[PDB]
Amino acid sequence: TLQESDKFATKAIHAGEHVDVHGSVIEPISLSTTFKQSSPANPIGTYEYSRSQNPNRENLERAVAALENAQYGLAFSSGSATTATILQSLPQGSHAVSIGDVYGGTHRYFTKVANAHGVETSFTNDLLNDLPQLIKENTKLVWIETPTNPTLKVTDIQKVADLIKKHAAGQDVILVVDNTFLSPYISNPLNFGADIVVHSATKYINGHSDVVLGVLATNNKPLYERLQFLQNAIGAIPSPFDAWLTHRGLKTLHLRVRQAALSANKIAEFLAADKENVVAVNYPGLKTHPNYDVVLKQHRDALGGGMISFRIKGGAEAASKFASSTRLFTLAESLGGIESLLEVPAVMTHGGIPKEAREASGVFDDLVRISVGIEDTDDLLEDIKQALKQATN
Amino acid sequence: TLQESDKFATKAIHAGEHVDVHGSVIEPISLSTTFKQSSPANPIGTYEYSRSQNPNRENLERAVAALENAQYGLAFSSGSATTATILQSLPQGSHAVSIGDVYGGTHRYFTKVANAHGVETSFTNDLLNDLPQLIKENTKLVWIETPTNPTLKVTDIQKVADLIKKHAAGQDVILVVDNTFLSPYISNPLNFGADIVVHSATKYINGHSDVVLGVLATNNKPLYERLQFLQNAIGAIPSPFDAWLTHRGLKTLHLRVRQAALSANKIAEFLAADKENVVAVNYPGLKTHPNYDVVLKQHRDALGGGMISFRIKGGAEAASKFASSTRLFTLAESLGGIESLLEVPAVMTHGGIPKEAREASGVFDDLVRISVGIEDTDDLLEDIKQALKQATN
């Protein structure tokens, strides 16, 4: 096979194909540390040392770039190490801006590599209105997590990309978009003036919950050589095994996301018709979504994704309740898995954060977050129903 | 089993034991991303998210700590990520000192995390004499690679710890020892006034070269909690698979290192009587070793390790010769491999470092560096011989 501007599905199946003399339709698992060489100076095949590069990683990387309509890609130990290679690629003592509704990741990473006080950070909700007033103070990074977790607030990647060129032209301010929740299938941030697309491969891409891997894609060659250097040097790289496993699960990503999203929409609509036991509902798929205009311009076919957020006509109990009365959806952490899961950001995730903010940024104390899996739609829909009542009673 | 201050070998086999309701003698490979929870608040068992912690990694770490006579252990994606995690725990804008004869590692990591010019670095040969004059200039770390590659100079970990307490008491200067080549079986730096022990697990712990992973061990609960935070936050973590494989590999570590040492020594004694074709020989196990006194106070039973370094009765050729004529020792990089290898630091390794230094630090141009594996001693002894002449001829 040899792609030539085929469709997404065709690309998932063959992008990042491999090189085998034997003729293996399937890629082998190369865990080899080192490789023999023709002359001391240079190898008996493009590979010299695993960490520097190995076939499984390299190939998973070529695949994620393509799927992400990007020229380049790099896999790391996790999503956290990926965000972190980015932050440490920043000139010493810099500043970065990011949406509020973010994983504690930024909090963490942003700060750590900001050893003692290194990389400044000014969290900001509503990106398009405070970015100009904030765009400087040493800024060099703009971090957007398109659909926020759990509120699900979509952001206009283009309006941001522009607003930057405007309020900070000449100072190399790169824009990074976290595209984990939608996944390469639903959207491609680079196609909207984004310098780097970052994913937590643990979720959708691998999609089977058995690999903690992260990846980034960029069309900017220099920004990609720097970032790869840090990779080769700080060594927060992925295991040939995890890459290969992830590479394998991404081949059904288009299939798994399509299904996962239809179902989500069919579940949101249901919860958005029950004026009774359902207070608010969050799902970028609903035409009533606050930024549905962006959905239609960044989301393929306007798929809402697999995440749905909603608050019931009750309180913390009903929610903590729903989280258990459930039979098919499994209470836990994480998401984007092959199996349905549901979590209450407030308690589970957003812990060390006073209810003070868990009302402001959106994280309502009585909010139930859910990750739609690929189980039968009706078996799941009917299940959400069967659980509302329980909570109510 | 339940260890109770048993012997190294017993600990290698039962430290880091696992829990399994099915009563498995062998620890299963857990790749799950998440774990179910009884109540939104907390899990149906001690684990919540694989990156935060998972059975395979955690057991590996208890095992490594055990063998290192240490209370705590942490595993990461690689040696380089382990050194990294340590330098980024240092307060912003800090300095460190380290023996000259080091892997490019320090240079790299030390600088990278010293974003632009962050973590200072003053390399120094002969630690015990220039350390007091250097102990400041912003120093917070002293890095020691006990057996220097490839000169094989041994450093007294105690004298350095003491010297530190003297010329810089009151400044939390932590001492880290890279104990990779010797491995936990041959030495335990914590027992000599070292605050952290580092291992690139690929060489001898895993011992089969089929895994890139690194770990550290400490007795200091605070330093361990900080380091663990960065572990969870930057996410430069190992794959439950590479961790489980490495743990599997660790179980024959006492056997594998013991052998590799008896043979290295019996080989060193051979090259140490051939006054003809042998210029010099470097093996910490020879009673004629410069710091043999330190070998005696820090090396179990005085084993020298499996790394011999020697200079033949000729030059660049005779070495580049040997490096090939050999039948049993395989020309490449790396080491600590189960299989016998051989490398010429100068070329293969220390590249972009002008001959100027490659005669300074000790990295002689006509020096042959070998890594004794586990084949038959005599088969190996005899091969080294049949190899001298080739070179000669």
Next chain:
Amino acid sequence: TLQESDKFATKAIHAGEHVDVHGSVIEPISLSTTFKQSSPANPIGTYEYSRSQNPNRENLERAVAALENAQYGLAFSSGSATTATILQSLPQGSHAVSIGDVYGGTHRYFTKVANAHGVETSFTNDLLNDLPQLIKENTKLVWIETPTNPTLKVTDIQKVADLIKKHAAGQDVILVVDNTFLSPYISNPLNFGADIVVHSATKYINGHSDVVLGVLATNNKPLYERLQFLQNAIGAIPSPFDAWLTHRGLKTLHLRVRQAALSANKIAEFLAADKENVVAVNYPGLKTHPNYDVVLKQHRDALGGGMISFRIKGGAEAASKFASSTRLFTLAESLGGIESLLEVPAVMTHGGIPKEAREASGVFDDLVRISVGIEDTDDLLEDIKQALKQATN
């Protein structure tokens, strides 16, 4: 989760659930050979010896049985060893009947286990008409490969089941149906008076062609107990890894096959309207299929499967041509791969069998066989076209 007569998709996700005290959502890979015991008599948990039974294999077996709407399942090293265990459970020196359009598998296995001349074998095309005439001569087995490779002739599993109770009631003649190409999703032979369903898990269940493993399922307890005995005594079992990897791969079986089918169906009808370059088309999904009456009664939603067989308006070349000119369809062997493949049964497969037969059973010398993967539909449809011409010219 705990299924309760849910839909296929839900079963595929939750059938064969595992048990683990750490509450992992994903089943761990258990490779362990043995299990600890409380007392000499019996284990500290349901398992005693891996080959006798281990969690990964057991859970897959339940999973497969469920998706196959059956009470029992058994996994072996391969399709072939699955067929053997069966043939070798037949009373010494017996006879069996099977549709001609069969893999060489029957040939081999049936023969081998028929040591020297043990298990008789009377291949017979057109089952329903000569089965009464051959039902005896020592028969004890009738082997149906529902969609014949490659002709794609569908057989009525009921009509045969009945015929048998007729021309041989009172002689335990077991009906075995190979349900590999269609897979549990498209059909369930048990629901049609079949004693055993077989699958070569390599193609569609594991799906990603990275595992050789076979399984069967039956509702018959005795037959299952004998078979399971041979399994434990000959030991032709798969490895816990191969089992887990297959299990992982089945979780998207419904998404994968449903797709491959709609695509296969859309590429048939195209090929089935080009009266010009297309002679005949073979796709159980066309309402013009010889046994489309049987397709409607046995195939779910009337899916045709992902196997299309057709003959262009030319000869050998044009076919061998097509098998190359194609860009998206990868020329090779096997099939039911995640990726589109095409083969010419005659050459590639049906070798050591004279053109004599290769015009009889239907294996036409100018017949193009293709397996539909999960690449984009139009990319593939458009590609078949792009291929027809090349061959033409």
Next chain:
Amino acid sequence: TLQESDKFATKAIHAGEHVDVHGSVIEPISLSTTFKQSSPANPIGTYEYSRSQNPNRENLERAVAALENAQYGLAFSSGSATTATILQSLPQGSHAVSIGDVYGGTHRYFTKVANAHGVETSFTNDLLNDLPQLIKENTKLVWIETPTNPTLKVTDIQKVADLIKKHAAGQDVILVVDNTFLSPYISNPLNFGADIVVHSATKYINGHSDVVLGVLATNNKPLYERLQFLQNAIGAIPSPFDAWLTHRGLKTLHLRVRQAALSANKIAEFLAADKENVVAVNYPGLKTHPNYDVVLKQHRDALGGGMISFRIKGGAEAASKFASSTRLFTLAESLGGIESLLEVPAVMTHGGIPKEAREASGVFDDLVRISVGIEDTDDLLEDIKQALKQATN
């Protein structure tokens, strides 16, 4: 590397080397089902189909054969599958002979492929005295389990090979010897007139208790080609992963087996000087062993192995007691593991066999059988002591 009649440890580390253009010092895991082809006729590399052959198996096979001082090797799903292929390779309606003290393996297998009543089987204890009288009755196979499990009775492979040439010249009676318990290291049955060496690689070869794989070796090219035939046709093949994991355990076979043996010997002497609490003790390494003369001619350095067997100065309780009072040894089935194990053949193993026999073959009801691992020797010795008293009190 290129072996040239080097020593066992050298062959262990290099026999079975692989082919990689890249130059991997470490053999990669090839799971690929298939391989591409130069021309429809023959591939683009000596491999065409995984089953017919794949690198990981083949390389394993080469290594085992080499360690077994043999020309040929063949791996299978299990020891059982390996015994199975051998029995089904026999001419329809044959007879075999094997030592009484055997694993239910002959029993099951010998009988199964002996469909209904196919391959005869006359179990005999004391081989050299009843072999002439039984040698016929249709016999074609003579199965010898050198050290019997668990009495630990040694048999003279030469006396029996000879005895066969005398009482049955001309009838191709092949002699197979189960070399599992001693392993390639301690003995090489072919060098003693044996036509086939069988091993359960689950035990000492892989030796980490995470793989069920069996392998045989023979110098007889015709017997090897028939047997490989059945292999390819029945499909009871090992997986690429299990072969790879095993090959990786075999690299320390000589170090592990060397240690397990010294320990078991030092433990047997202890139990053979405790006139008080130890009735009898079975260990082929004690000069007082009934067949010590054979030991000294078949066993390397006269190593007794890792399996001891003994009866305590009490009865059934004292034993069941011992089997639990132990801290370091682990009560379970199996053996040859890296970690110590202990079992009571009577109950655990030999269940469905009336006490009647369990006093005949020697499987005394008050007999404790132990599998010495590689933990420290004194820790284990001191642990056996500490447990005799427990059983006593």
